[PDB]
Design an enzyme around this catalytic site. Structure first.
Site, PDB file in Angstrom:
ATOM      1  N   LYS A  78     -20.253  22.026  16.906  1.00 27.01           N
ATOM      2  CA  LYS A  78     -19.742  21.300  18.078  1.00 27.01           C
ATOM      3  C   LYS A  78     -20.220  19.902  18.073  1.00 27.01           C
ATOM      4  O   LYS A  78     -19.705  19.090  18.815  1.00 27.01           O
ATOM      5  CB  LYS A  78     -20.145  22.002  19.351  1.00 27.01           C
ATOM      6  CG  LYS A  78     -19.451  23.361  19.356  1.00 27.01           C
ATOM      7  CD  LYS A  78     -19.419  23.918  20.781  1.00 27.01           C
ATOM      8  CE  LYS A  78     -18.285  24.953  20.852  1.00 27.01           C
ATOM      9  NZ  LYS A  78     -18.823  26.183  21.443  1.00 27.01           N
ATOM     10  N   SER A 117     -19.770  29.589  12.776  1.00 27.73           N
ATOM     11  CA  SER A 117     -19.654  28.449  13.681  1.00 27.73           C
ATOM     12  C   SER A 117     -20.963  28.089  14.387  1.00 27.73           C
ATOM     13  O   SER A 117     -21.115  26.945  14.826  1.00 27.73           O
ATOM     14  CB  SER A 117     -18.560  28.705  14.717  1.00 27.73           C
ATOM     15  OG  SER A 117     -18.483  30.067  15.099  1.00 27.73           O
TER      16      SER A 117
END
Lengths: 328, 328, 327, 325
Positions: free
Chosen positions: C53, C306
């Site tokens: 992110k 992720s």
């Protein structure tokens, strides 16, 4: 003869990172302050063979069939392309024979053998070494690895421009040295597919301007004589496929004399502490001339230090010219 | 910590916090020279330090060892070259004010190198002696702590970390060759190695026209040299240090001197084997080793020298290259 | 609503490598031999904040206006987006305030503070934390940094896909976890502009499949309840701009249950020695189920790890389910 | 039985950096604030085989004669030592056979094969696999690579302590886990030759305290039962040479229970993001106990994360104990 769209995908498919690495894009601080522009150097001297040529040679040689790899590869080279092919051959497990002129320095021949290549000394000049390499190609079934005129070789050098756009997408203009035009074609086709606002300018030594001659004439032509000061760009005739790409995508071309080249070698030594070979400083010399001729200010400008395989005793000539420039 | 014994120097070398600024440098084999001279010839690459010379080791150890009062008052020294770059970098890393005094005639590239590392520069004096006199006066007036370039036990221990790294990178070493200016680097290497692997020979190397240690060894105490050669700037020292001479007379195994042409040949050897451009003082020790190998008919051994620095004036290289061309 | 070409240039212009880095693309050896495919994992846990992110957060924040940075930035986040905005603000010299639910673990708010961000604890759940963040945004003038629904956030995540294509252009399929949809939109728009032959598959947890619900309905819809097991993908409504791209470029979508996710955590720990969080192993779980349902053999298949910001005590649930699978 | 000065020269001559690397010395930030000391961890889990054992194994194997290398090496191990011997053999171009109990987990056999070792599964426990290893050594002439009781193994591990002194010379105390005592001997002998003011403290699991037992008796004894929770330190009898060095050079010894080990695993996961195996968190647990027992504040204290080859499902027990605490 692919279109720009196919070249973009070939640049992505080219497996250069199994041998070559991503090289730094460094700001030249002294020269940036002096010339009122942000001047960045693409440090291809940091590749394992200390020139960019590893990219296109490995791309082409990895893409050969199993049959072609089993019969080995051949080429003719004065130095940088030979080290690219020797290094790629060691990595791929493929036999490589490099034909070099008999006058080639022992340090250059040793470097090629150190990287895992077989060397054949033949010929009074590069033309006779290339004739022997093509003859031996047809006689003994070696695959010829061209130093520039080949789509897979052009795509491989195009990986350099793809790194540039990710390292600095606000670039204004990129200056590329030209021998046969493999690098310039790869950079120019890649940049015009992804970020066409960026200007790509070819740089040539005045006594080795085979692309300028081809552009003037409108097709590839032979030069009567090619200067040997800048070994890497001492090419008599621009390539067929490279010219097709360069004529289509280049934004401009500029030529420079031996004095400017030597001044650029000094500039790079004082700003990034590297001794470039004359063809490695060529694009910088062109950029400096472009900046003055066009009065460029406030831009982000990049050139490719394409190689740093210099003859030590050959540095006398470069340093003498620099001393002569100080006297003026 | 005024005239320590060997055991106290050994612990000081472990305690020197040199890795807060310096780094472990490679110990590389010189392939061509090793095959040519029938010995394994290794080079300690101190040119790879952030200031491109070993002097960062001693300067940072000495400056980090100062009291909180002294650090708040800043440090001062007199130097136009490597020592000034080491003090400037250390002061930036320690967050301490540093003033470096240089002769007014010093070249811009030297001044800007020290400034770029974080040091305030005061140009003053017609020669080095006047620059040093000003620095010592400003030390008394404004309370700057003087940072000596070699004659200090903490500076000596800081350089000794080089030799501790050598023992871990190759404990099978036969002889180590060290350049000598004021003797700081040789004292540290000698006392360290004689505490841990006393069977290893440590040999000092001096320029013929700058051999203040050979003069002090002939006389048995520090003596002044009438004239010092300036070709090898790093070792242009008129008088050996008191503490360094104590350790050098106690722990060195041999000493050798070489002329300017031997240095020039060594610069060429280092450019062709490890692709580095050494300054004359950085090739001194290799020159010393090559003479020693021939005088003593040494074969089949492991020999190390220290490339102690690579801060070179580009235009100064033409003398080195001219002598190399005359050497064939 | 940019076109594919504009997203491609935005990906190249995203200054992500001033904060984030190029992450390895590793082969999983044990799993590859077992499932007769070359299975590659994109190690986004190796980012400074240990999730992807950082890419979209830094790109969006670097691209504001000098006036916007002076006023500061605000966001609401349960963990990984918070550390991306905190880290990006420190690198950019911008004030960042993060609203987090009061129940957030001290290790999570300390990580946000350690990265240099102001934390405001408020709300019984993420909704009330976002409401306070948008409220402070209108009142005091902090620029809201969206976790996914923003072209520049999407372009930032797209840099992950551009790396994939240069790290392995012979890929057959790429499996992407989906929460709000920013990563799946970045990866899908980038790849379809450069190598459209490559298949992009979205993966969602069964009790949080708001993209599946949006695709079924033809528009974004609200999910009644969202599972909290996989925190990072616990989003009730798919983003408007991420849905547009996902509907337009995705090749397929698949859902998996908590057992599959927990099994994929164990796989990643044994093949590449990483402890993924549930959202980080999600794509792998989808890939395994896709391989079996479609009888895939001899292909090159990539998934994205992720994130790897796991609550240590929270690992008991994952380990418990794996023991139940072993029995 | 070399002297302290000879071991020092051995540690310098150990060619460990041909296979092993210098590992980080990292500060634990959260644990340093909570315990009012600068607590540093030596990350031996970052070695190519994820334990320190590659140091001792490579140093011993590189020191073998050309004939010994040509005949190959053998050892018996189900875990970290096997991977070190396997990896060293691949770097030295030497054949290595590793004997493991037949019940050894597949991922452990595959990890040794992946590093370049031949695995022979044999025996109902470690003792039966070792007996086959020595038997095959005596018949076919494989050189036996000992896991700890060997001077070159000891000097190989001692390189760890020489790194520590150069990474942080203001260290007050170093805590070392002990199975057979090869690591503790190498660390203690090195430090006492160069910086004897630094305290070296051995840490042992209560269920596997063969060194405390040997110190109580004054010579190596056999432990009746050994605990298997901390696999790497589940050693029945301290070595002869490692006990000689430990008895002379250690400053102190401390034992801890399983719950202390579990709590240390949680601390390392939260401070440095690594999952240690129980033997790798043992030193930290001992240091936390030491800090409380002696009211240590404001010092610089180092422990060795000795390995992170963990059984994933095994983490369930560790996690359960951490929730109960």
């Amino acid at each position: 003869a692919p279109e720009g769209a196919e070249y973009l995908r070939a640049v992505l498919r080219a497996p250069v990172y199994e041998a070559a690495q991503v090289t730094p894009l460094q700001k030249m601080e002294k020269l940036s302050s002096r010339l009122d522009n942000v001047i960045l150097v693409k440090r291809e001297d940091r590749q394992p063979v200390h020139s960019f040529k590893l990219r296109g040679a490995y791309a082409m040689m990895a893409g050969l069939t199993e049959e072609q790899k089993a019969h080995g590869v051949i080429t003719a080279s004065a130095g940088n392309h030979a080290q690219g092919v020797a290094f790629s051959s060691a990595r791929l497990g493929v036999k490589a024979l490099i034909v070099m002129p008999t006058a080639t320095a022992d340090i250059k021949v040793d470097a090629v053998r150190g990287f895992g290549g077989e060397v054949l000394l033949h010929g009074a000049n590069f033309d006779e070494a290339k004739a022997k390499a093509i003859e031996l190609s047809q006689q003994q079934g070696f695959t010829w690895v061209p130093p520039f005129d080949h789509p897979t070789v052009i795509a491989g050098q195009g990986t350099l421009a793809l790194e540039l756009l990710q390292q600095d997408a606000h670039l204004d203009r990129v200056f590329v040295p030209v021998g046969g035009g493999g690098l310039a074609a790869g950079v120019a086709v890649l940049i015009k597919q992804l970020m066409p606002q960026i200007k790509v300018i070819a740089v040539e030594a005045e006594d080795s301007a085979c692309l300028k001659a081809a552009l003037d004439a409108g097709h590839p032509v032979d030069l009567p004589r090619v200067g040997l000061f800048a070994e890497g760009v001492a090419v008599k005739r621009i390539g067929d496929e490279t010219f097709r790409l360069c004529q289509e995508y280049l934004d401009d071309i500029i030529t420079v004399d031996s004095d400017a080249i030597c001044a650029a070698v000094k500039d790079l030594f004082e700003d990034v502490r590297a001794v470039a070979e004359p063809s490695g400083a060529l694009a910088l010399a062109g950029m400096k001339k472009y900046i003055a001729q066009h009065n460029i200010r406030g831009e982000r400008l990049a050139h490719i230090l394409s190689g740093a395989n210099v003859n030590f005793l050959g540095l006398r000539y470069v340093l003498e010219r620099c001393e002569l420039l100080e006297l003026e």
